[PDB]
Short mmCIF file of all heavy atoms in Angstrom, two decimals:
data_model
loop_
_atom_site.label_atom_id
_atom_site.label_comp_id
_atom_site.label_asym_id
_atom_site.label_seq_id
_atom_site.Cartn_x
_atom_site.Cartn_y
_atom_site.Cartn_z
N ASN T 225 -77.18 36.44 -39.12
CA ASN T 225 -77.33 36.31 -40.56
C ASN T 225 -76.34 35.32 -41.16
O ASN T 225 -75.34 35.72 -41.78
CB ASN T 225 -77.19 37.67 -41.23
CG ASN T 225 -77.68 37.67 -42.68
OD1 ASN T 225 -78.55 36.88 -43.06
ND2 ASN T 225 -77.13 38.57 -43.49
N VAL T 226 -76.59 34.04 -40.94
CA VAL T 226 -75.72 33.00 -41.47
C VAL T 226 -76.37 32.55 -42.78
O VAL T 226 -77.55 32.23 -42.80
CB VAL T 226 -75.57 31.82 -40.47
CG1 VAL T 226 -74.82 30.66 -41.09
CG2 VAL T 226 -74.84 32.28 -39.21
N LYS T 227 -75.61 32.56 -43.88
CA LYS T 227 -76.17 32.17 -45.16
C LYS T 227 -75.54 30.98 -45.83
O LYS T 227 -75.92 30.63 -46.95
CB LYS T 227 -76.12 33.35 -46.14
CG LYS T 227 -76.90 34.58 -45.71
CD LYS T 227 -78.30 34.19 -45.28
CE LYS T 227 -79.14 33.64 -46.42
NZ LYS T 227 -79.50 34.71 -47.40
N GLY T 228 -74.58 30.34 -45.17
CA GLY T 228 -73.93 29.19 -45.78
C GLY T 228 -73.00 28.49 -44.82
O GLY T 228 -72.64 29.05 -43.78
N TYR T 229 -72.61 27.27 -45.19
CA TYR T 229 -71.73 26.44 -44.38
C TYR T 229 -70.89 25.66 -45.36
O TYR T 229 -71.44 25.14 -46.32
CB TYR T 229 -72.55 25.50 -43.48
CG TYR T 229 -71.77 24.40 -42.75
CD1 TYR T 229 -71.17 24.62 -41.52
CD2 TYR T 229 -71.62 23.14 -43.33
CE1 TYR T 229 -70.42 23.62 -40.88
CE2 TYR T 229 -70.88 22.14 -42.71
CZ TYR T 229 -70.28 22.37 -41.50
OH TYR T 229 -69.51 21.36 -40.95
N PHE T 230 -69.58 25.61 -45.11
CA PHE T 230 -68.61 24.91 -45.96
C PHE T 230 -67.82 23.88 -45.15
O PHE T 230 -66.99 24.25 -44.32
CB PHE T 230 -67.59 25.90 -46.56
CG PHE T 230 -68.17 26.82 -47.60
CD1 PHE T 230 -68.83 27.99 -47.23
CD2 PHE T 230 -68.06 26.52 -48.94
CE1 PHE T 230 -69.37 28.84 -48.19
CE2 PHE T 230 -68.60 27.37 -49.91
CZ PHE T 230 -69.25 28.52 -49.53
N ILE T 231 -68.03 22.60 -45.41
CA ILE T 231 -67.31 21.59 -44.67
C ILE T 231 -65.89 21.53 -45.19
O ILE T 231 -65.66 21.75 -46.38
CB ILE T 231 -68.00 20.21 -44.79
CG1 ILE T 231 -67.38 19.25 -43.79
CG2 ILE T 231 -67.86 19.66 -46.20
CD1 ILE T 231 -67.99 17.89 -43.81
N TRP T 232 -64.93 21.35 -44.29
CA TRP T 232 -63.55 21.21 -44.68
C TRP T 232 -63.31 19.71 -44.51
O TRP T 232 -63.52 19.20 -43.41
CB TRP T 232 -62.59 21.98 -43.75
CG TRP T 232 -61.15 21.71 -44.09
CD1 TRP T 232 -60.40 20.65 -43.67
CD2 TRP T 232 -60.37 22.38 -45.09
NE1 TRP T 232 -59.23 20.58 -44.37
CE2 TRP T 232 -59.18 21.63 -45.25
CE3 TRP T 232 -60.56 23.51 -45.89
CZ2 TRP T 232 -58.18 21.99 -46.18
CZ3 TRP T 232 -59.58 23.87 -46.80
CH2 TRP T 232 -58.40 23.10 -46.94
N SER T 233 -63.00 18.97 -45.57
CA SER T 233 -62.80 19.47 -46.92
C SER T 233 -63.73 18.69 -47.84
O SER T 233 -64.35 17.72 -47.42
CB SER T 233 -61.37 19.23 -47.35
OG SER T 233 -61.02 17.91 -46.96
N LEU T 234 -63.82 19.10 -49.10
CA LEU T 234 -64.68 18.38 -50.04
C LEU T 234 -64.15 16.96 -50.16
O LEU T 234 -64.89 15.99 -49.99
CB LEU T 234 -64.70 19.06 -51.41
CG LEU T 234 -65.49 18.31 -52.48
CD1 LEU T 234 -66.99 18.34 -52.16
CD2 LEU T 234 -65.22 18.93 -53.82
N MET T 235 -62.85 16.83 -50.40
CA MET T 235 -62.24 15.52 -50.51
C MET T 235 -60.99 15.50 -49.62
O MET T 235 -60.64 16.52 -49.02
CB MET T 235 -61.89 15.20 -51.97
CG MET T 235 -60.63 15.89 -52.51
SD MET T 235 -60.91 17.42 -53.35
CE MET T 235 -59.81 18.50 -52.59
N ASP T 236 -60.33 14.35 -49.50
CA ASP T 236 -59.16 14.27 -48.64
C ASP T 236 -57.96 14.97 -49.25
O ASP T 236 -57.68 14.80 -50.42
CB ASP T 236 -58.79 12.81 -48.33
CG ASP T 236 -59.85 12.09 -47.49
OD1 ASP T 236 -60.50 12.74 -46.64
OD2 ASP T 236 -60.02 10.87 -47.69
N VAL T 237 -57.30 15.82 -48.47
CA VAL T 237 -56.08 16.54 -48.89
C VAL T 237 -55.08 16.45 -47.72
O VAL T 237 -55.49 16.36 -46.56
CB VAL T 237 -56.35 18.05 -49.24
CG1 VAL T 237 -57.44 18.16 -50.29
CG2 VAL T 237 -56.72 18.86 -48.00
N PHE T 238 -53.79 16.46 -48.00
CA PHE T 238 -52.84 16.37 -46.91
C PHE T 238 -52.95 17.57 -46.02
O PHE T 238 -53.37 18.65 -46.46
CB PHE T 238 -51.41 16.21 -47.41
CG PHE T 238 -50.78 17.46 -47.91
CD1 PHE T 238 -50.19 18.35 -47.02
CD2 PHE T 238 -50.75 17.75 -49.26
CE1 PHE T 238 -49.58 19.51 -47.47
CE2 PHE T 238 -50.14 18.90 -49.72
CZ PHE T 238 -49.55 19.79 -48.82
N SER T 239 -52.58 17.38 -44.75
CA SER T 239 -52.64 18.44 -43.75
C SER T 239 -51.31 19.17 -43.64
O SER T 239 -50.25 18.54 -43.72
CB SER T 239 -53.05 17.88 -42.39
OG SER T 239 -53.15 18.90 -41.41
N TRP T 240 -51.37 20.48 -43.43
CA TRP T 240 -50.17 21.32 -43.34
C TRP T 240 -49.08 20.74 -42.45
O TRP T 240 -47.99 20.40 -42.93
CB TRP T 240 -50.53 22.73 -42.89
CG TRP T 240 -51.39 23.45 -43.86
CD1 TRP T 240 -52.72 23.76 -43.72
CD2 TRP T 240 -50.99 23.97 -45.13
NE1 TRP T 240 -53.17 24.43 -44.83
CE2 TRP T 240 -52.13 24.57 -45.71
CE3 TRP T 240 -49.79 23.99 -45.83
CZ2 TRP T 240 -52.09 25.18 -46.97
CZ3 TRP T 240 -49.76 24.60 -47.08
CH2 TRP T 240 -50.90 25.18 -47.63
N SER T 241 -49.39 20.57 -41.18
CA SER T 241 -48.41 20.05 -40.23
C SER T 241 -48.81 18.75 -39.59
O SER T 241 -48.40 18.49 -38.46
CB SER T 241 -48.15 21.11 -39.15
OG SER T 241 -49.34 21.42 -38.44
N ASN T 242 -49.57 17.92 -40.31
CA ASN T 242 -50.03 16.64 -39.76
C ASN T 242 -50.00 15.49 -40.75
O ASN T 242 -50.42 14.38 -40.44
CB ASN T 242 -51.43 16.78 -39.15
CG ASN T 242 -51.54 17.96 -38.19
OD1 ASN T 242 -51.78 19.10 -38.62
ND2 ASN T 242 -51.31 17.71 -36.91
N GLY T 243 -49.51 15.77 -41.95
CA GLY T 243 -49.40 14.75 -42.97
C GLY T 243 -50.70 14.33 -43.60
O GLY T 243 -51.75 14.88 -43.31
N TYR T 244 -50.62 13.36 -44.50
CA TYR T 244 -51.79 12.82 -45.19
C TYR T 244 -52.63 11.89 -44.29
O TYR T 244 -53.47 11.14 -44.78
CB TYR T 244 -51.35 11.99 -46.41
CG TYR T 244 -50.72 12.75 -47.57
CD1 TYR T 244 -49.67 13.66 -47.38
CD2 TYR T 244 -51.15 12.52 -48.88
CE1 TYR T 244 -49.08 14.32 -48.47
CE2 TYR T 244 -50.57 13.16 -49.97
CZ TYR T 244 -49.54 14.06 -49.76
OH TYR T 244 -48.98 14.71 -50.83
N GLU T 245 -52.36 11.89 -42.99
CA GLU T 245 -53.07 11.00 -42.07
C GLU T 245 -54.39 11.59 -41.64
O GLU T 245 -55.41 10.92 -41.62
CB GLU T 245 -52.25 10.77 -40.80
CG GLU T 245 -50.74 10.60 -41.03
CD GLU T 245 -50.37 9.35 -41.82
OE1 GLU T 245 -51.24 8.46 -42.03
OE2 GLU T 245 -49.19 9.26 -42.24
N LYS T 246 -54.32 12.84 -41.23
CA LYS T 246 -55.48 13.57 -40.77
C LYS T 246 -56.49 13.85 -41.90
O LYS T 246 -56.48 14.90 -42.51
CB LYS T 246 -54.99 14.88 -40.14
CG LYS T 246 -55.99 15.54 -39.22
CD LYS T 246 -55.38 16.68 -38.41
CE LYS T 246 -56.42 17.27 -37.51
NZ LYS T 246 -55.91 18.39 -36.69
N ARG T 247 -57.36 12.89 -42.16
CA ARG T 247 -58.36 13.04 -43.20
C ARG T 247 -59.56 13.83 -42.72
O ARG T 247 -59.91 13.79 -41.55
CB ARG T 247 -58.76 11.68 -43.73
CG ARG T 247 -57.53 10.93 -44.14
CD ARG T 247 -57.82 9.54 -44.56
NE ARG T 247 -58.01 9.50 -45.99
CZ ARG T 247 -57.14 8.98 -46.85
NH1 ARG T 247 -56.02 8.44 -46.41
NH2 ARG T 247 -57.41 9.01 -48.14
N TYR T 248 -60.16 14.60 -43.62
CA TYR T 248 -61.31 15.44 -43.31
C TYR T 248 -62.42 15.38 -44.37
O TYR T 248 -63.52 15.85 -44.16
CB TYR T 248 -60.88 16.90 -43.30
CG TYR T 248 -60.27 17.47 -42.05
CD1 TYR T 248 -58.91 17.37 -41.80
CD2 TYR T 248 -61.04 18.25 -41.18
CE1 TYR T 248 -58.34 18.04 -40.72
CE2 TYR T 248 -60.48 18.92 -40.11
CZ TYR T 248 -59.13 18.81 -39.88
OH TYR T 248 -58.59 19.44 -38.77
N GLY T 249 -62.11 14.80 -45.51
CA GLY T 249 -63.04 14.83 -46.61
C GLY T 249 -64.35 14.11 -46.60
O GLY T 249 -64.52 13.16 -45.87
N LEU T 250 -65.26 14.60 -47.43
CA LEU T 250 -66.57 13.99 -47.66
C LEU T 250 -66.30 12.84 -48.63
O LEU T 250 -67.08 11.88 -48.72
CB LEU T 250 -67.55 14.97 -48.34
CG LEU T 250 -68.25 16.07 -47.54
CD1 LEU T 250 -68.77 17.04 -48.53
CD2 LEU T 250 -69.39 15.55 -46.67
N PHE T 251 -65.22 12.97 -49.40
CA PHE T 251 -64.85 11.93 -50.35
C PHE T 251 -63.45 11.41 -50.00
O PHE T 251 -62.52 12.18 -49.77
CB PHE T 251 -64.91 12.45 -51.81
CG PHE T 251 -66.28 12.91 -52.24
CD1 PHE T 251 -66.65 14.25 -52.11
CD2 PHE T 251 -67.22 12.01 -52.73
CE1 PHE T 251 -67.94 14.68 -52.44
CE2 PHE T 251 -68.52 12.45 -53.06
CZ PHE T 251 -68.87 13.78 -52.91
#
């Protein structure tokens, strides 16, 4: 029963222990 999926992240945000280098955003 999977009802949704959330990509990390909506936009680029700095990473906890990896700095602002590790980008993940859709924006």
